[PDB]
């Protein structure tokens, strides 16, 4: 048990030999955020160990209302979930590795470390992986907009895990000076949010945000305060008229009741998909995670100046436009948008809390005209609506992130767009069908790095190559002295100092840097 045992400040833990890698799982990095610690900042884990800690159990998911659990009851996970899991390749020739820290996606509402497979990256064997668990949904992100319930608990959980990695990953054979922080979807937005902290360079050497960034409209949201009291009203806390008594009452309810009440916010299947999300915190809440619009943070230059890459895929908006092609008895769900567009588009595209009712309806009319024209909403116009979702949910925020970083930051900033449709992906799950070519949907690229149950077990020959390319891209990025970035045969071109955007196009059998006034 020489390799299975690891010395931490609290004592020793025992991991598992998996043949090609060692795993040390469910290591707590904070006190359980239960009872009086619900809706509070994470507390550093303080318990000392008298025995050998059993680090052999799969990290539990955070208690969540999981979109992709079928059935009326989508509650899964545990409230006691603040854990890191370390995966180290087995190699008789090599025991020091760079580190990829991983933040799972799931719209800040659901998802889990264990659903992001580590077999692909362990088989390639070029870095240690650390999966971070963090509070989700109302438990991670409920907010009244004041210092009694400021919010962003899940982002503070991630940051404390990042400190844990700095302090302890060398006990596992990791190089703490070579940490690359990566994440997809809400994980990618979280990575960008962590990077926006001024001291982020002390926690990581580099960062990579896949199909998620701090400027996407489902990330930093307005309207949380009323959502918080709306949650209070659904769980028997209608009598609370201020933040402090709302917090007290909410803490008197079982966590499962609070999370189940997420269902009351979902007014069309799983729509809006992020009723709880990051927010701006007030200047008088100590330890606040973010208090300024991230655009103003970037312009100030006062953020972690590390190399960063941000990416999207060409039909990214398949999450979650594809739920509109789900068939019913009466017809197809998208048919309803011919009558309900003004009601639903602000929820689907995340501008219901940032515009007046008049401006909201004008924008709904405007974007429908530009993308759909005079077509009716049906399967024939679905591709144009999916393009609208791709642009507002994912692409526009990528372009604006890249624009602000290339102008106001000195560190290299890179980007790619991926176009290579998977056989199946998240869109077949949302639409419950396989008779429509959705294109390259949210997660088609990232699933090649961390395998999951949504795509095929077997990768096509081209995908096996692309997968190794991505994994090696991340490995080299974590070890890079100069902040350069390379996919396969293509160096990424830095966007700093170029008039046009520099966007690496990755496709089935190659890649090529392209230059754009605006993203295509």
Residue 229 CB partners (closer than 8 Å, separation 6+): 144, 240, 246
Instruction: Give dist(CA 184, CA 165) in Å, integer.
Output: 20
d(CA 317, CA 348): 11
- 107 by Cβ neighbours in 10 Å (0-12 / 13-18 / 19+) ranks as buried
Tell me the C-alpha distance between 495 and 479, whole Å. 21
CA 4/CA 186 separation, integer angstroms: 33
Structure tokens at 46: 């303080």
Provide the CA 218 distance to its chain's centre, in angstroms.
11
Task: Please report the DSSP string for 211-278 in residue order.
Answer: S--TTSTTTS-S-HHHHHHHHHHHTT-TT--SHHHHHHHHTTS-HHHHHHGGGGG-SSSS-SS-SS--
| Determination technique used | X-ray
Give bridge partners of residue 223 from the DSSP assignment.
none
What are the backbone angles phi and psi of residue 116, rounded to the nearest 5°?
-100, 95
Rounded distance between C-alpha atoms, residue 192 and residue 409, angstroms:
14
SS (H, E, C) 350-410: CCCCCCCHHHHHHHHHHHHHHHHCCCCCCCCCHHHHHHHHHHHHHHHHHHHHHHHHHHHCC
Task: Give the whole-angstrom CA distance, residue 243 versus residue 144.
Answer: 6
Q: Quick count: other Cβ atoms within 10 Å of Cβ 165?
A: 24
Rounded CA separation 108/515 (Å): 33
Selected catalytic residue, list 442, 447, 467, 480? 442
**Closest listed residue to residue 504, CA positions, set 516, 393, 159, 140:** 516
Contacts 24+ apart (CB under 8 A), 377-381: 377/334, 377/335, 377/337, 377/338, 377/341, 378/332, 378/334, 378/335, 379/325, 379/332, 379/334, 379/436
Would you state the structure tokens that stand for residue 436, as one six-digit string?
A: 């429509």
Distance CA 212, CA 311 (A): 8
The resolution of the experimental structure, rounded to one decimal in Å, is 2.2
Question: What sign has the CA pseudo-torsion 259, 264, 265, 269?
Answer: positive
CB-CB neighbours of 134 under 10 Å: 31
Round the CA-based radius of gyration of the chain to a whole number and report it. 22
Catalytic-residue membership of 192: no
Q: Are 101 and 132 in contact, with CB atoms under 8 Å apart?
A: yes
102 counts as catalytic = no
Question: What is 77-122 written as a DSSP string?
Answer: SBS---EEEEEEE--SS---EEEEEEE--STTTS--GGGS--HHHH
Distance in angstroms (rounded) separating the CA atoms of residues 514 and 314: 14
Q: Give the start-to-end residue ranges of the domains of the chain.
A: 1-520
How is residue 259 written in tokens?
A: 């999370």
Among the options 23, 143, 185, 190, which is catalytic?
185
Element (H, E) at 512: strand 510-516
Q: Measure the CA–CA gap between 446 and 410, rounded to whole angstroms.
A: 28
Q: Which residues contact 394 (CB under 8 A, 6 or more apart)?
A: 211, 212, 216, 312, 316, 317, 442
- Residue 188 per-residue DSSP state: H
């Amino acid at each position: 048990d020489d390799p299975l045992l690891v010395q931490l400040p609290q004592g020793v833990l025992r991991g598992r030999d998996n043949g090609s890698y060692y795993s040390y799982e469910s290591i707590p990095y904070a006190e359980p955020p239960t009872g009086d610690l619900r809706f509070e900042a994470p507390e550093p884990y303080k318990q000392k160990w008298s025995d050998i800690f059993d680090a052999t159990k799969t990290p539990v998911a955070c208690l969540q209302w999981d979109q992709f659990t079928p059935g009326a009851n989508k509650l899964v996970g545990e409230e006691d979930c603040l854990t890191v899991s370390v995966y180290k390749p087995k190699n008789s020739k090599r025991n020091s590795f760079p580190v990829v820290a991983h933040i799972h996606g799931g719209a800040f509402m659901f998802g889990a470390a264990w659903q992001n497979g580590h077999e692909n990256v362990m088989r390639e064997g070029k870095f240690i992986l650390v999966k971070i668990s963090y509070r989700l949904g109302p438990l991670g992100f409920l907010s009244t907009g004041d210092r009694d319930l400021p919010g962003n608990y899940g982002l503070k959980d991630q940051r404390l895990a990042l400190k844990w990695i700095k302090q302890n990953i060398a006990s596992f054979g990791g190089e703490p000076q070579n940490v690359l922080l990566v994440g997809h979807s809400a994980g990618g937005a979280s990575v960008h949010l962590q990077m926006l902290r001024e001291d982020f360079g002390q926690l990581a050497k580099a960062a990579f945000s896949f199909s998620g960034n701090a400027l996407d409209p489902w990330v930093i949201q307005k309207g949380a305060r009323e959502r918080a009291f709306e949650l209070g009203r659904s769980v028997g806390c209608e009598s609370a008229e201020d933040s402090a008594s709302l917090k007290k009452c909410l803490k008197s309810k079982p966590a499962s009741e609070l999370v189940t009440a997420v269902r009351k916010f979902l007014i069309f299947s799983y729509v809006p998909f992020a009723p709880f999300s990051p927010v701006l915190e007030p200047s008088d809440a100590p330890g606040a995670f973010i208090t300024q619009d991230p655009r103003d943070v970037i312009k100030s230059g006062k953020f972690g100046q590390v190399p960063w890459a941000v990416s999207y895929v060409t039909e990214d908006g398949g999450y979650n436009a594809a739920l509109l092609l789900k068939e019913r008895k009466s017809g197809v769900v998208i048919d309803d948008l011919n009558e309900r567009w003004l009601e639903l588009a602000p929820y689907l595209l995340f501008y219901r809390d940032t515009k007046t009712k008049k401006d909201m309806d004008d924008y709904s009319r405007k974007i429908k005209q530009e993308y759909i024209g005079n077509q009716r909403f049906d399967i024939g116009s679905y591709s144009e609506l999916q393009r609208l979702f791709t642009d507002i949910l994912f692409k526009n925020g990528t372009q604006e992130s890249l624009d602000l970083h290339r102008k106001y930051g000195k560190s290299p900033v890179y980007a790619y767009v991926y176009d290579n449709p998977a056989e199946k992906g998240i869109a077949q799950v949302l639409a419950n069908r396989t008779d429509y070519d959705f294109g390259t949907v949210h997660g088609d690229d990232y699933s090649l790095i961390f395998e999951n149950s949504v795509r095929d077990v077997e990768m096509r020959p081209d995908e096996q190559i692309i997968s190794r390319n991505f994994i090696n891209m991340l490995a080299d990025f974590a070890s890079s002295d100069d902040g350069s970035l390379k996919y396969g045969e293509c160096d990424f071109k830095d966007n700093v100092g170029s008039e046009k955007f520099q966007l690496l196009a990755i496709y089935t059998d190659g890649c090529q840097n392209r230059q754009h006034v605006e993203f295509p």
